[PDB]
Amino acid sequence: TVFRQENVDDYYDTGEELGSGQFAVVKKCREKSTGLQYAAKFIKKRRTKSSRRGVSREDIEREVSILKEIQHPNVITLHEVYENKTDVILILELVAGGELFDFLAEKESLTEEEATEFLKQILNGVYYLHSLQIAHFDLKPENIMLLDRNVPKPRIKIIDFGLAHKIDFGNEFKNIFGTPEFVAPEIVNYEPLGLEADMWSIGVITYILLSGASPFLGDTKQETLANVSAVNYEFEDEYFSNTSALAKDFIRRLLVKDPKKRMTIQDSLQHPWIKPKDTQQALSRKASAVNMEKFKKFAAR
Numbered sequence: 155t156v157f158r159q160e161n162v163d164d165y166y167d168t169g170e171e172l173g174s175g176q177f178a179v180v181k182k183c184r185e186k187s188t189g190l191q192y193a194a195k196f197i198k199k200r201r202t203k204s205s206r207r208g209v210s211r212e213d214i215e216r217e218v219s220i221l222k223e224i225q226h227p228n229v230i231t232l233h234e235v236y237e238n239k240t241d242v243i244l245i246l247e248l249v250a251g252g253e254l255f256d257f258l259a260e261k262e263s264l265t266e267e268e269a270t271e272f273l274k275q276i277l278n279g280v281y282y283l284h285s286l287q288i289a290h291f292d293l294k295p296e297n298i299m300l301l302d303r304n305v306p307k308p309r310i311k312i313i314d315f316g317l318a319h320k321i322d323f324g325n326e327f328k329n330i331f332g333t334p335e336f337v338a339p340e341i342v343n344y345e346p347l348g349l350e351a352d353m354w355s356i357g358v359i360t361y362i363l364l365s366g367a368s369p370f371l372g373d374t375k376q377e378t379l380a381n382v383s384a385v386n387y388e389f390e391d392e393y394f395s396n397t398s399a400l401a402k403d404f405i406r407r408l409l410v411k412d413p414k415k416r417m418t419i420q421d422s423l424q425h426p427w428i429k430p431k432d433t434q435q436a437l438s439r440k441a442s443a444v445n446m447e448k449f450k451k452f453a454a455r
């Protein structure tokens with residue numbers, strides 16, 4: 155595949171840095187023909203196969219091919235792709251409202267009901283992806299962003315498709331990648347991967363959202379990975395005293411070692427913490443609250 159060969163500067167004015175990755179810088183940009191704003195993600199090509207100073211073409215093409223297919227309110231879309239001698243440049247939907255957790259940490263309080271309204275949008279974005287056999291594989295709080303934080307109901311946008319893969323029937327995918335505190339045991343243990351890893355990651359996100367504690371984070375990388383592999387976590391009363399039983403059950407069904415026994419996205423949407431079956435369930439959720447003092451501390455990390 156060949157992407158657009160023109161100088162991106164002919165079509166866009168580039169602005170400030172929005173963020174960066176190992177081999178990527180993301181800048182705000184303005185499309186000259188429309189005056190509309192986008193995010194330009196400049197990915198460094200490795201260029202020579204023996205160089206470790208950039209991304210392989212296969213990995214860039216994969217990210218691009220996944221982003222091209224996706225069209226859903228809770229995931230970013232690809233607008234255009236350009237390339238020059240050094241870079242592949244992805245013009246992405248601009249997400250301007252920062253990370254979800256930073257926005258939530260500015261609130262005075264947050265009930266589980268209010269928390270689930272945000273979580274539900276993540277679940278909807280992932281439901282979409284999984285419906286197309288796309289595993290995101292890098293779900294973590296920093297990849298959960300807000301389109302615009304200054305509206306009454308902020309919209310979640312899942313970003314960062316640098317690790318995403320189409321799950322292809324007939325060919326096993328195994329790899330070790332991603333951030334130790336957020337990856338599933340099958341990633342840790344180099345076992346067959348699928349849509350299930352994302353579900354684990356959602357359990358981790360939810361655990362942090364409610365408590366301000368990371369379920370598996372140890373004092374070293376090696377220790378974090380051992381916690382994940384052993385499914386060594388607790389609902390510490392210091393953090394979870396005001397957390398509903400339905401919320402803990404939601405989490406418990408996601409933080410499951412065997413991928414085949416873990417809750418699927420479709421089941422997570424029907425879980426009573428997400429979709430209460432009666433008045434009593436809806437009342438618990440409303441009555442329960444995020445641990446805001448502790449949560450605010452997490453977001454500061």
Ligand SMILES: Nc1ncnc2c1ncn2[C@@H]1O[C@H](COP(=O)(O)OP(=O)(O)O)[C@@H](O)[C@H]1O
Pocket residue numbers: 172173174175176177178179180193195230246247248249250296313314315316317
């Ligand atoms: N569509 C976007 N809108 C606004 N900021 C973005 C967008 N995509 C990425 N960023 C910012 O740039 C950072 C790096 O982008 P990301 O896609 O995460 O790169 P990588 O896959 O190399 O980690 C992100 O953490 C985020 O802060």
Ligand SMILES: [Mg+2]
Pocket residue numbers: 175314316
């Ligand atoms: Mg990233």
